[PDB]
Every structure is written in structure tokens, then in C-alpha cells.
RNA sequence: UCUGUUUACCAGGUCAGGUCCGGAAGGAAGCAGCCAAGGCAGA
RNA sequence: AGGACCGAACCGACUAAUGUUGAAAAAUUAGCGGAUGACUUGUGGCUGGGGGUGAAAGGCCAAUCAAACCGGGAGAUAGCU
RNA sequence: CGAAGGUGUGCUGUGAGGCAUGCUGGAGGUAUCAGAAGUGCGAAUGCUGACAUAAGUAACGAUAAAGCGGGUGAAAAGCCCGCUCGCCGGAAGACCAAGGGUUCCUGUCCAACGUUAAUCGGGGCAGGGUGAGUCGACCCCUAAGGCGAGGCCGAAAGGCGUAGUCGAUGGGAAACAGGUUAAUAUUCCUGUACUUGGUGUUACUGCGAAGGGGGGACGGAGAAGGCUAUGUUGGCCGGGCG
RNA sequence: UACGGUGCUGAAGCAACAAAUGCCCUGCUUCCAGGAAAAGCCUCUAAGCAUCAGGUAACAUCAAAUCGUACCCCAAACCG
């Protein structure tokens, strides 16, 4: 849902550029 | 108490503004002296 | 008006939450335009370049902020913002 | 260029100029949407414009 | 709250589905600003993450702030890796504590929308 | 001496995950979880 | 009717104390005078130093006035320290 | 294989001084006899910088006043949340002009700044934010006053002023209620309007100015009648039996 | 309901009284110290122009440019 897409998206991704 | 500087823009610019200087011989001498000392701004303009 | 002037008016799409809000809800787009352009010329230029129907253009001027870089005091440049109302039968193109 | 443009008439040059401004417009559009990779393009066109204009003048001038 | 228990289960539920070619194509705004090939090695790094979070005692996970020099020697020894990697894994966990406490305070829309992509001057990448 | 629960690495055993050696066969040091065990208690 | 009376805003500054390296380079607190007029206040203008302006105290002219301020003569002069 | 300079130590000259040398320093120094001097400092209420002293003293800006629970957090007397307490209320409230110029709103940070801490801020960094035919400025018109073609005057510069042309603090067309933003709204949105111009048609038609006349167009004091904003009570409607 | 709000629905919506320093009123009465200018605005015509032009009314139609607009203003943002 919304908290699973806000979990996974910025988890995988915002672990990428940082 | 009431101090000496009570600011006004229209006053400021009619008294010391660019055009006000340029009006007269003396003023253009001011602007001469300033341009000769090489100021950042000559007059008071915005 | 000449077209040559037109293509020089519109700098950039303005992106922000307010922008998106109006674009969705009221059918309106937000533009950074040349500081000197007028409501006439912006109406003309959108109607021409995006080929869609403009109702009215409201504008404002943004004074750039004042910044410090390494103690030095600079001044970000001014610019002009335009709220551009599209007639409702239109749907947006971005080219 | 500039030999290439020199051999074209004034009309074809006006037309090229307009193409160029369309291309330029389109470009800084892409660049302000963050959709540009190749920045070097802006300079390319921004300068070509000048080239064209500088010709128009001398064709009117003399 | 948010622990390395919920981070353990976050990353062990995410080591089933996690991939770098399926999740660098589910966002159009973050793969055009930072490079599209800086994503991750998902299987290597998530099996690393799960390894390192297996090397912990359970109150070292439920209370991540008590992990010190000896704890990181023991964790880095447990899974066969470097103390620096465990350092950067507890770093990653710290960033995610930041983000999910921020998602706790701010409404889901105002903390997902105010999210910013950042460069050091307007010129591309420097 | 049963039961309740406590003690990160630096007492023990199992040692998942992961990691070293090997092409492979397999070994191995051992983090966690568990049981001894040591704190402290119901008897 | 009134340079009338009592009295707030408003204008002022009579006494007392505090303050006196102040909360303030002239104030505060408690009282005091005028308060429909020779009143009071806003915006703008005018008068320039051997001059202004003064219900006149040598008062006032940017916290500097028995002759403003700034630059010049100028390194005035100093039988004085 | 260690110059100048810094720091010691030892020796030597009647004295200003000289020599040697341990450490420091890391690249310049200079015998001899001459030459030229910005040539020697403790004072000048000397000039600049640095560091003392009083002293961890005085002081921390209105004697309107705080208390507790929870949250955040490395750390909460001061921040956010809730609850009681207290002060202003012809203001310590709300809206402008002036003046300022981003201080507005969000996120983030706590060195310096804030007379203490500060997680907070009018502080730092990044982003956003100011939407007008009818609100102002512009614009039309003039006041005092200014500038002022020709002109009069004046050693030169310049002074005065005519026709003009500027100059608001004054005169000149027109929009309201409601809804909305984290931050604009008489501007955006909903509804309902209004004014002045341009072109067009149609019907009618003497139209024309820098000239003429009206209008615009004006004091103080007073009086008190008509009202409205507004408020109080009742009716009304919703809830309450504590 | 992310506990920040979003959406739907929506009662009554009157009367008496009091009442300004606001409005009627740039009025009215009185006094003497006798209380701006000019344009928009209405009308009269000269030069002129006359079936042109131009004026009046209704309907249609277009235009209304630009700049200010945040926030503070009995003040921690103005003058000290
Ligand atoms: Mg509009
Ligand atoms: Mg505007
Ligand atoms: Mg600039
Ligand atoms: Mg006064
Ligand atoms: Mg006096
Ligand atoms: Mg008093
Ligand atoms: Mg009194
Ligand atoms: Mg008396
Ligand atoms: Mg009295
Ligand atoms: Mg007066
Ligand atoms: Mg006097
Ligand atoms: Mg004085
Ligand atoms: Mg004098
Ligand atoms: Mg004299
Ligand atoms: Mg002399
Ligand atoms: Mg002397
Ligand atoms: Mg002499
Ligand atoms: Mg040495
Ligand atoms: Mg030596
Ligand atoms: Mg030397
Ligand atoms: Mg030496
Ligand atoms: Mg030496
Ligand atoms: Mg050395
Ligand atoms: Mg050395
Ligand atoms: Mg020497
Ligand atoms: Mg010598
Ligand atoms: Mg000397
Ligand atoms: Mg000395
Ligand atoms: Mg001496
Ligand atoms: Mg002294
Ligand atoms: Mg120094
Ligand atoms: Mg001292
Ligand atoms: Mg001391
Ligand atoms: Mg003492
Ligand atoms: Mg004492
Ligand atoms: Mg004191
Ligand atoms: Mg004390
Ligand atoms: Mg205080
Ligand atoms: Mg607390
Ligand atoms: Mg507390
Ligand atoms: Mg307090
Ligand atoms: Mg509270
Ligand atoms: Mg009172
Ligand atoms: Mg003023
Ligand atoms: Mg302003
Ligand atoms: Mg700032
Ligand atoms: Mg703020
Ligand atoms: Mg903030
Ligand atoms: Mg501090
Ligand atoms: Mg403290
Ligand atoms: Mg601290
Ligand atoms: Mg700030
Ligand atoms: Mg108006
Ligand atoms: Mg005049
Ligand atoms: Mg002349
Ligand atoms: Mg004159
Ligand atoms: Mg004029
Ligand atoms: Mg003006
Ligand atoms: Mg005005
Ligand atoms: Mg006006
Ligand atoms: Mg506001
Ligand atoms: Mg007339
Ligand atoms: Mg009048
Ligand atoms: Mg009268
Ligand atoms: Mg009524
Ligand atoms: Mg009932
Ligand atoms: Mg009144
Ligand atoms: Mg009044
Ligand atoms: Mg506004
Ligand atoms: Mg406002
Ligand atoms: Mg005031
Ligand atoms: Mg106030
Ligand atoms: Mg101040």
C-alpha cells in the first residue's frame, strides 16, 4: 500500500544516493 | 526621545538624490569629487 | 506581434506545490518569464507555442533573496512569475 | 559554418533563424525541466544564432 | 518504536523482493538527478545486512545505541567482515531511524512531498 | 535439589545466518537463537 | 457667547524620590499646568553662518552655537608645558 | 656536516660590547678597511596591537507570576502538547500609512549570535511565498513651492521672472458576500454586479475650443430632529437535568 | 481519519427596546476673524465642417497597459 511503497521506495533508493 | 533622524524617502531624494545634485554647479562638483575618489555609490539612490 | 519576440518570452516552467495545486484544481500553469514581458505577450506566446487556449494571465514579480557566500553578500536576480489560466477544454502538453 | 550560411539568400536565412529559435526555445525548455543531459547544446545554438544575425546585417549593410 | 528488530524484519522481508533493476525503474525523478547506475548490488548487500543483523544479541538490535567498539569487533568477527562495514550499516540504520521518526511526526504526504534531491551549486554534479 | 526469570565479546556444547581453505568431496573459527552455567528469587 | 469653568486622549514640564559606570548621552514612578484655541498634530515647501530664525533665554539651526558643519590655506602661531 | 632569527650556557673587554657553544630553526649570512644614514627609547595624560588588574565581584532591561503531567531529546525551569493559575483589554487587541526589505511559511542545524540552557528563535543553510479593468501608485488637475524658452539683470559663475512646464498633504470613472493556502487574496475560486474607453450596427440628429458661462467650491461655533452600526431582553431552535 | 483533518447532512434564522462621537448634514441656525486653485463634468457658440464629419440611445463585440501586494508597524522588524 502507501506505507509499504513509502517504506520500500525511499528505503532501497534513499539507501542508494546517500 | 525624538531623535534627529526621522527618515523619509521623498525628502531624502529631493535633498541629496542624483538629480538634485546635477541641478547645480556645486552638485556636479560633488559628483566630480566622488567620481575622482572612486566611490561605490555617489549619491543616495534606492 | 512578431513571433521572434515571442520565442524569447517564456523561460521555464515553475515547479512547486502551489503550482501543482492550481494546475490540478483550477486548470492553471505557472511560468518564469522574461522580466519585461507583459500580459499581452504572454497570452500570445502560450497560445502560440503550446497551441492551447489561454483565458487570462495574472502576474507578479519576485524579488530575489539576499545571500551570503563565504562572508560575501550577494543578491539573487529578480524575476517574473505568471499564473496562466487555460480554458477548461484544454489538457496540458509539455514539449 | 559561416561559409555555408554565407551562400544562402536572406529569406532562407530568416527561415533558418526561426528554426533556430524554436530549437533554442525547446532546448532551454528541456533544460529547465531537468530533462537535459547534453548541456553543450545550448551554447551550440545560442552561438549559431549570432552567426546568422551577423550575416543578415552585412547583407543589408552593403 | 523503530528498532533493529523491525529493521531486521524490514531487510529480511526486503531481501526476498529486493532488486536494483526493478526499483531504479519504479521512480522517474530520482534516476535522472543522481546517476541511474548508483542503485545497489541487492543480493550481496542485503545478505550482508542480514548477516550483520544476525551477528547481534537481541537487546543490541532492540536498543541499537549501546553498540560500541567491542560490540563492533564482535559483530565484524561473527559474520567475517570489516568493522567499517558494520559502521556503515549502523549508519544506514541511523538514517532510516531518522526517516521513519520523521514519517511518524509528519503526515505521510507532507514528509514524502517535502523530500529533496540535492547538488552543491546549480551546475550539474559540481 | 524442581519452577520463575536474568548474564553482549573476552567460561562450555549445539552453533542457523554469513565468512575462511578446496575445481569438488567436504572440513573450519565462530556471532546470534537454545541448553548447560553463573546473578537473584517462588519452595 | 467665551484666549470661560471641571476634566480624559492630546500638548506640556511645577515639586519629590529613584536613577547618576542609568532601563534612558535628560528617563521613570507618584502627584502638577493648559486642554475651542495666541491650541495641537500629519504630509510637502521656504529662510544658510560677517547668515538665518527668535512672545528675546544669546535661545535655536542634526545629541556640537558670544558666530554650525566638512574640505582647503596648514606643518596657522605658540617668548608656554 | 645546518645561515639569519629564537632560547640557554661558558668565556673575554674600562664601557656600549665581542667570541665560542648545547637546544630551536630550516636558508640565508658576511671578514677587512672605507662610504651613506629613516642609527640605538622607559617616560611625551605619546600612537597601534596584545595581555593584565579590580573579580569570578557589580550586573542579567520594568515587582504582570507562576505550577504540574506528558512529548521530543545527548541533556528540558525556559521548546511543543494538555491542565489549572495570573496580566493587558480606548490595548500589552485588530487594520493601514510612513520606515524597514524577506524578518513571512516549511524543513533542517546549534559553532557564533540570544545578557543562562536552548531541542527554541526575528540566528545559520536549503527550499517555497506576494496572482487585481473596479485596493493603491502610475495617470488627469492644480496648492505652497520649484525649474524656467525668449526676456530683464549681473566682473565670471550666476540672480530674478514671462509663456510654459513640474509639484499632493488636496479635486478626478467603477466590486460586493461567501470558499480556499503551511504562508496571498476586496487580486485565486463560487455567485452576483459595475465603470470608462475602442469598433460595429441600427434609429435619430448641428457637430466643432486653449475662447464664454455654470459646476466643481470649500470657515468656526452651535442646536436637535431622523436614523443606522451596534447592543440588551423576549420569542424561536438545538442541546441540558448536572 | 496518517488523529493533523476530509466528506456528507444541516434546525431556527424573528420581535420589542436602547443607541452613537457614524450617517442625513458640503444641511440647518448664528458669529466675525469672512473662510484653496485647477481639470474631469454640464451647457454657449468662433475658426470650421456639412447627404462627410460628429452627437444621442439600445443590442453585439473587443480592451482596460504597467508597478506595489509577503511580514512588521501603541514595535525584538521604524528613530534611539
Ligand atoms: Mg482575473
Ligand atoms: Mg499586478
Ligand atoms: Mg546578481
Ligand atoms: Mg509631540
Ligand atoms: Mg518648552
Ligand atoms: Mg508624570
Ligand atoms: Mg493632566
Ligand atoms: Mg485655569
Ligand atoms: Mg482643565
Ligand atoms: Mg496646520
Ligand atoms: Mg517661541
Ligand atoms: Mg543642538
Ligand atoms: Mg560663522
Ligand atoms: Mg564674527
Ligand atoms: Mg600660510
Ligand atoms: Mg600645529
Ligand atoms: Mg614659524
Ligand atoms: Mg641542528
Ligand atoms: Mg649558528
Ligand atoms: Mg639582514
Ligand atoms: Mg643567534
Ligand atoms: Mg643560532
Ligand atoms: Mg625543524
Ligand atoms: Mg631538523
Ligand atoms: Mg648580523
Ligand atoms: Mg663603518
Ligand atoms: Mg628613530
Ligand atoms: Mg618599548
Ligand atoms: Mg629619559
Ligand atoms: Mg590613563
Ligand atoms: Mg592582531
Ligand atoms: Mg580592562
Ligand atoms: Mg581575574
Ligand atoms: Mg570586592
Ligand atoms: Mg557582594
Ligand atoms: Mg548597576
Ligand atoms: Mg548580585
Ligand atoms: Mg529580562
Ligand atoms: Mg520533561
Ligand atoms: Mg516540563
Ligand atoms: Mg520563565
Ligand atoms: Mg502551554
Ligand atoms: Mg483603561
Ligand atoms: Mg514621517
Ligand atoms: Mg514599503
Ligand atoms: Mg536573513
Ligand atoms: Mg517564523
Ligand atoms: Mg524553522
Ligand atoms: Mg547561548
Ligand atoms: Mg541554564
Ligand atoms: Mg551545549
Ligand atoms: Mg531565520
Ligand atoms: Mg481608486
Ligand atoms: Mg506656479
Ligand atoms: Mg536664458
Ligand atoms: Mg527662476
Ligand atoms: Mg502637472
Ligand atoms: Mg509623482
Ligand atoms: Mg494623495
Ligand atoms: Mg487621489
Ligand atoms: Mg498573514
Ligand atoms: Mg471654466
Ligand atoms: Mg476640498
Ligand atoms: Mg456656514
Ligand atoms: Mg437596528
Ligand atoms: Mg429542551
Ligand atoms: Mg469623533
Ligand atoms: Mg473620528
Ligand atoms: Mg496581500
Ligand atoms: Mg497583508
Ligand atoms: Mg504610537
Ligand atoms: Mg500592537
Ligand atoms: Mg532597535
Q: In chain C, where are the structural domains located?
A: 1-95
Taking the CA of residue B46 as centre, how many other CA atoms within 13 Å lie in the half-sphere pointing to its CB? 0
Cα torsion angle, D4, D5, D11, D12, sign:
positive
Cell matching residue E47: 545478505
Taking the alpha carbons at both ends of chain A, their separation in whole angstroms is: 25
**Contact (CB, 8 A) for C59 and C39:** yes
Architecture of domain C1-95 in this structure = 2-Layer Sandwich (3.30)
| Cα–Cα distance for residue pair B18/B27, rounded to 1 Å | 9
Q: How far apart are CA C49 and CA C42, in angstroms?
A: 10
Query: And the C-alpha cell for D34?
Result: 531537468
Radius of gyration of chain C (CA): 15
This entry's atomic model was obtained through cryo-EM
CA–CA gap between residue E125 and residue E32 (Å, rounded): 12
Identify the CA nearest to A2 among candidates E46, C21, E111: E111
- Contact predicate C6/D24, CB 8 Å: no
Number of domains, chain B: 1
Are residues D53 and D61 in contact, defined by beta-carbon separation less than 8 angstroms?
Answer: no
Q: Which helix (H) or strand (E) holds C83?
A: strand C79-86
The answer to whether residues E56 and E75 touch, using CB atoms and an 8 Å cutoff, is: yes
C39: cell is 500580459
Count of helix runs (H) and strand runs (E) in chain D: 2, 0
Comparing CA positions, the residue from E51, E55, E30, E4 lying closest to residue E117 is E30
B19 touches strand G (CB under 7 A): no
CATH of residue B26: 1.10.287.3980
Task: Determine contact: D33 vs chain E, CB below 8 A.
Answer: no
Calculate how close chain D gets to C7, using CA atoms only, in Å: 6
User: Is the distance from CB of A9 to CB of E23 less than 8 angstroms?
Assistant: yes
Helix (H, G, I), strand (E, B) or coil at C84: strand
Cell 514524502 -> residue: E112
Residue E95: phi and psi, rounded to 5, are -60, -40
Suggest the residue from A4, A9, A14, A16 to mutate for an interface test with chain E (most E CBs closer than 10 A): A16
DSSP C9-73: TEEEE--SHHHHHHHHHT-EEEEEE-TT--HHHHHHHHHHHT---EEEEEEEEEPP-EEEETTEE
Tell me which chain D residues have a C-beta less than 8 angstroms from the C-beta of C4. Answer: 17-18, 21
Task: Enumerate the domain spans of chain E.
Answer: 1-126
Indicate the resolution in Å: 3.8
Q: Which fold has domain E1-126?
A: 434 Repressor (Amino-terminal Domain) (1.10.260)
- Angle, vertex CA E95, rays to CA E92 and CA E99, nearest 5: 135
Amino acid at each position: 500500500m502507501k506505507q509499504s511503497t513509502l517504506a520500500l521506495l525511499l528505503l532501497l533508493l534513499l539507501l542508494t544516493p546517500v | 526621545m525624538k531623535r534627529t533622524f526621522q527618515p523619509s524617502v521623498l525628502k531624502r531624494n529631493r535633498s541629496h538624490g542624483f538629480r538634485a545634485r546635477m541641478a547645480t554647479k556645486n552638485g556636479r562638483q560633488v559628483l566630480a569629487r566622488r567620481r575622482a575618489k572612486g566611490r561605490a555609490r555617489l549619491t543616495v539612490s534606492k | 506581434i512578431r513571433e521572434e519576440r515571442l520565442l524569447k518570452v517564456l523561460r521555464a516552467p515553475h515547479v512547486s506545490e502551489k503550482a501543482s495545486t492550481a494546475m490540478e484544481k483550477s486548470n492553471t500553469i505557472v511560468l518564469k518569464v522574461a522580466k519585461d514581458a507583459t500580459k499581452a505577450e504572454i497570452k500570445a506566446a502560450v497560445q502560440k507555442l503550446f497551441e492551447v487556449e489561454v483565458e487570462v494571465v495574472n502576474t507578479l514579480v519576485v524579488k530575489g533573496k539576499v545571500k551570503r557566500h563565504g562572508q560575501r553578500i550577494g543578491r539573487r536576480s529578480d524575476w517574473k512569475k505568471a499564473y496562466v489560466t487555460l480554458k477548461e477544454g484544454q489538457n496540458l502538453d509539455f514539449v | 559554418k559561416a561559409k555555408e550560411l554565407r551562400e544562402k539568400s536572406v529569406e532562407e536565412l530568416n527561415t533558418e533563424l526561426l528554426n533556430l529559435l524554436r530549437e533554442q526555445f525547446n532546448l532551454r525548455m528541456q533544460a529547465a525541466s531537468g530533462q537535459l543531459q547534453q548541456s553543450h547544446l545550448l551554447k551550440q545554438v545560442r552561438r549559431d544564432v549570432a552567426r546568422v544575425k551577423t550575416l543578415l546585417n552585412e547583407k543589408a549593410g552593403a | 518504536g523503530f528498532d533493529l528488530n523491525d529493521f531486521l524484519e524490514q531487510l529480511r522481508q526486503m531481501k526476498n523482493m529486493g532488486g536494483x533493476x526493478x526499483x531504479x525503474x519504479x521512480x522517474x525523478x530520482x534516476x535522472x538527478x543522481x546517476x541511474x547506475x548508483x542503485x545497489x548490488x541487492d543480493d550481496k548487500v542485503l545478505v550482508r545486512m542480514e548477516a550483520i543483523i544476525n551477528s547481534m544479541t537481541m537487546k543490541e538490535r532492540a536498543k541499537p545505541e549501546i553498540i560500541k567498539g567491542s560490540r563492533k569487533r564482535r559483530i565484524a568477527a561473527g559474520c567475517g567482515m570489516q568493522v567499517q562495514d558494520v559502521n556503515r550499516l549502523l549508519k544506514q540504520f541511523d538514517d532510516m531511524q531518522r526517516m521513519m521518526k520523521k514519517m511518524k511526526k509528519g503526515g505521510x504526504x507532507x514528509x514524502x512531498x517535502x523530500x529533496x534531491x540535492x547538488x552543491x551549486x546549480x551546475x550539474x554534479x559540481x
